[PDB]
């Protein structure tokens, strides 16, 4: 349903703290124009970035070994995966459960803003912070 829309999406911010977070290229496809969050949501749709994500803030976060870095397009490795940096989430950092998106919603990459959300609060982490890296907007207030 490609409907036409107004406005900057929350995921072509997200992009760049990506990058600065050491987990995608600065000549990543995902910073063309032409991109979407389709394709910054392919990325991640194997879990084998996201973990990384967390390895990059703090160390020993997860392990590369007890992730399948070559899923092969393998749904049973890939579901696998993402949930393993839901669990770093709370084991590594300690976040809320209820806030973690839906493995599925990834996956299927049904409800991609969701994924976004996870990580704008994640960036409060005084472990995200430490680094110094643009953090997300603080406040209740929407834009």
Same mark, same amino acid.
């Given at each position: ?6 406005? %900057? !999406? ?16 600065? #000549?990543?496809? *995902? ?16 879990? /084998? ?11 020993? @976060?997860? #392990?590369?070994?007890?992730? #399948?870095? =070559?899923?092969? %397009? @393998? ?15 709370? !084991?590594?950092?300690? %976040?809320?459960?209820? !806030? ?8 299927? /990459? =049904?409800?991609?803003?969701? *994924? ?6 994640? @960036?409060?982490?005084? +472990?995200?912070?430490?680094?110094? +890296?643009?953090?997300?907007? @603080? ?5």
């Amino acid at each position: 349903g490609s409907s036409g829309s107004s406005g %900057m !999406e929350p995921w072509k911010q997200c992009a760049q703290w990506l990058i600065h977070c050491k987990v995608l290229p600065t #000549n990543h496809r *995902v910073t063309w124009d032409s991109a979407q969050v389709f394709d910054l949501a392919q990325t991640l749709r194997d879990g /084998v970035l996201l973990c990384q994500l967390l390895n990059n803030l703090r160390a020993h @976060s997860i #392990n590369l070994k007890e992730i #399948n870095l =070559r899923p092969q %397009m @393998s749904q049973f490795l890939c579901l696998k995966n993402i949930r393993t940096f839901l669990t770093a989430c709370c !084991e590594t950092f300690g %976040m809320r459960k209820s !806030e973690l998106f839906e493995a599925f919603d990834l996956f299927d /990459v =049904r409800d991609f803003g969701k *994924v976004i959300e996870t990580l704008s609060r994640l @960036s409060r982490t005084p +472990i995200a912070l430490a680094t110094g +890296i643009r953090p997300f907007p @603080s406040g209740p207030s929407s834009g």
